[PDB]
Amino acid sequence: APLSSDELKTVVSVLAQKLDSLNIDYAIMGGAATCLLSGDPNRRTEDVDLVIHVDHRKITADNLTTQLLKSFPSDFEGVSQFGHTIPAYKLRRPGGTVQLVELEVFDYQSWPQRPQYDLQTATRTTLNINGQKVKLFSPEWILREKILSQYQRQGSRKEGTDIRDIISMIPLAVPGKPELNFNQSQELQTALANLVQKRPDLSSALKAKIKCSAVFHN
Ligand SMILES: [Mg+2]
Ligand SMILES: [Mg+2]
Ligand SMILES: [Mg+2]
């Protein structure tokens, strides 16, 4: 079930509380981030995707499952769909029953080919949900991911949502962040060329936020 905006906010505020209490640095990405930054309550998602920072304790994304189940047994339970146990938050509905919300957790050490997961350098932001600080990747970071995604998923059922997500993010971006400088990424240059070919009406709004000499000569 896609989570309502209210529900999503309950899930991430609790997760933020628990990660903070374990002193694990993190940032939320994916549909949750997009939804949290949306002005449209109809934009909804079904799980929470995040990156955590691994330090000397070696609480890797995989190892976090055990730590959550051990420290917060009231709030998390293990879910296994393909013989791999991951943590799910136990979202209580008003009538008292539990709706499981899966957590898709990543770390840089395990994905060296995704330097976007480096929490020490990625451009990031926070939201304050009724007093709780919730850590997210920034709109600039998200837009980079989405520009790539719309090209890689072109012709898929999700293409339209992606493009809608791009359009939502562009105005929240500011210029000058590394994630929106595409001069050293052939793959983002190509993805961007594909986007502005499809949606030339977005070209000036993107150009204001993105540095890419190949496409925008800026
Ligand atoms: Mg997701
Ligand atoms: Mg395990
Ligand atoms: Mg109920």
Question: Nearest ligand, CA of residue 98?
Answer: 3
Same domain, 78 and 170: no
Q: How was this structure determined?
A: X-ray
CA-wise closest residue to 73 among 88, 55, 61: 88
| 162 annotated as ligand-binding | no
Domain total of the chain: 2
Rg for the chain (alpha carbons), in Å? 18
Same domain, 45 and 125: yes
Say whether 62 sits in a helix, a strand or coil: coil
- Of the chain, the end-to-end C-alpha distance in Å amounts to 43
Same domain, 52 and 104: yes
Nearest-angstrom CA–CA distance, 10 and 142: 22
Resolution (A): 1.9
Same domain, 126 and 38: yes
Nearest-angstrom CA–CA distance, 218 and 212: 6
Measured at the CA of 78, the angle between CA 137 and CA 32, to 5 degrees, comes to: 25
Same domain, 83 and 69: yes
Domain enclosing residue 58, as ranges: 1-137
Nearest-angstrom CA–CA distance, 107 and 190: 27
Question: Nearest ligand, CA of residue 105?
Answer: 1
Runs of H (alpha helix) within the chain: 5-21, 30-36, 63-71, 139-152, 159-169, 186-198, 203-207, 213-216
Distance between Cα 92 and ligand 3 center (Å): 7
Residue for token pair 């939201």: 127
Same domain, 38 and 142: no
Same domain, 55 and 115: yes
User: Which of 79, 102, 137 lies at the terminal end of a domain, its last residue?
Assistant: 137
Nearest-angstrom CA–CA distance, 202 and 100: 38
Same domain, 51 and 131: yes
Same domain, 127 and 169: no
Same domain, 95 and 7: yes
Nearest-angstrom CA–CA distance, 138 and 142: 6
| 118 annotated as ligand-binding | no
- Supply the DSSP symbol for 93: P
Same domain, 161 and 132: no
- Supply the DSSP symbol for 202: G
